[PDB]
């Protein structure tokens with residue numbers, strides 16, 4: 453739990469996530485995607501449970517990435533919510549929501565949902 | 574626009590969201606929830622599009638709150654994903670995911686999903 | 696209760712839902728959507744709890760509509776999951792998932808999520 | 818596409834899904850779970866695109882299971898939305914919503930979301 457979150461992670465699509473977990477619950481780093489209207493790294497900020505477990509539970513966390521950087525602006529943001537599980541093969545299992553900024557007319561179709569699993573391999 | 578988002582907002586459950594949108598696309602503030610095993614204010618951090626479209630499109634944003642503060646720890650975290658819509662009655666419409674830490678065994682039932690609409694007070 | 700669910704309902708987008716709750720927990724009917732690449736009525740099939748709690752709890756139910764009829768085919772399907780709440784103003788509050796057929800490549804962006812509230816007309 | 822959906826499928830949790838896909842878009846069969854307040858088989862009903870693709874796309878489908886049978890009544894229902902992909906290893910990739918019937922007070926926490934992948938192995 454805790455510390456172990458810090459590092460570089462990868463998901464099934466090939467995106468790379470580099471985070472630093474601060475002693476008091478903060479998550480900071482950058483996200484470089486593999487899919488979408490994304491081009492380079494984007495900043496990410498999140499929060500995690502700095503005091504999880506002690507039944508074998510994972511550490512709840514979440515983070516956001518607005519898809520705007522110096523090269524692209526997709527006018528969308530993705531939030532990932534999930535939990536970290538350490539061990540010989542640590543992983544972060546997540547479900548995410550991607551909302552695009554639409555006009556009212558298209559508001560009903562503004563959010564996509566998916567799931568991503570990150571490993572350090 | 575940072576300015577339109579900065580403020581105090583409330584949702585249909587009676588929770589309070591105090592946020593500051595920074596120039597670099599950052600969102601920081603505190604959240605006071607009306608439901609859950611929550612007690613006091615919790616810190617929030619998020620991001621938004623500081624350069625949205627010039628179209629009456631909303632401004633996409635998102636934020637996270639881990640439900641642990643000096644008084645309580647619920648071992649869970651919620652992320653809200655949605656868009657800010659300004660005008661005379663500005664709203665932030667979101668969909669959220671609340672994940673609880675669990676054992677591998679109960680992981681299938683670790684995430685709740687819902688939706689909240691926030692109204693700005695000013 | 697089958698009876699309270701049977702009827703014509705409308706949601707905030709202007710779509711029509713005509714359903715019949717059968718005694719065995721089945722839901723059949725048609726859906727007329729206001730949005731999407733939809734044209735005419737589409738068939739729906741679902742299930743509900745024919746024996747809910749005796750608690751002012753809602754009655755859980757869910758249904759599916761594949762967006763293909765004799766006039767149009769959108770290669771997508773939506774499932775709504777929610778509960779029926781009876782009273783003077785009966786509502787069915789749902790959360791939905793709309794999945795489109797895609798190539799492995801775009802599969803990550805194949806599902807949309809939202810929420811609809813239906814009001815019964817009678 | 819089409820036909821290939823008919824059969825017995827299994828997901829990662831061990832639940833078994835037995836469906837029949839009808840020529841015009843119907844899905845009928847039974848679901849026997851591995852998790853929850855479930856006990857035996859439950860009836861399922863759904864719909865699928867009987868005319869998908871012709872770019873290599875999967876077949877969109879969805880189905881519902883109300884968790885009430887002659888032995889248990891969990892006062893909940895689950896809907897799975899996803900697409901079928903055939904081939905040497907056919908699979909159905911889904912995201913699901915599980916709603917329990919609550920009082921208004923707990924309505925905010927009535928729906929769980931997850932994802933399941935079914936294979937015939």
Ligand SMILES: [N+][Cl-]
Pocket residue numbers: 463465467548568
């Ligand atoms: N999403 Cl990645």
Ligand SMILES: [N+][Cl-]
Pocket residue numbers: 828830832913933
């Ligand atoms: N859920 Cl299976």
Ligand SMILES: [Cl-]
Pocket residue numbers: 584586588606607608689
């Ligand atoms: Cl809240």
Ligand SMILES: [Cl-]
Pocket residue numbers: 706708710728729730811
């Ligand atoms: Cl609709």
Ligand code: NA
Pocket residue numbers: 586588606607608
């Ligand atoms: Na809340």
Ligand code: NA
Pocket residue numbers: 708710728729730
């Ligand atoms: Na609709």
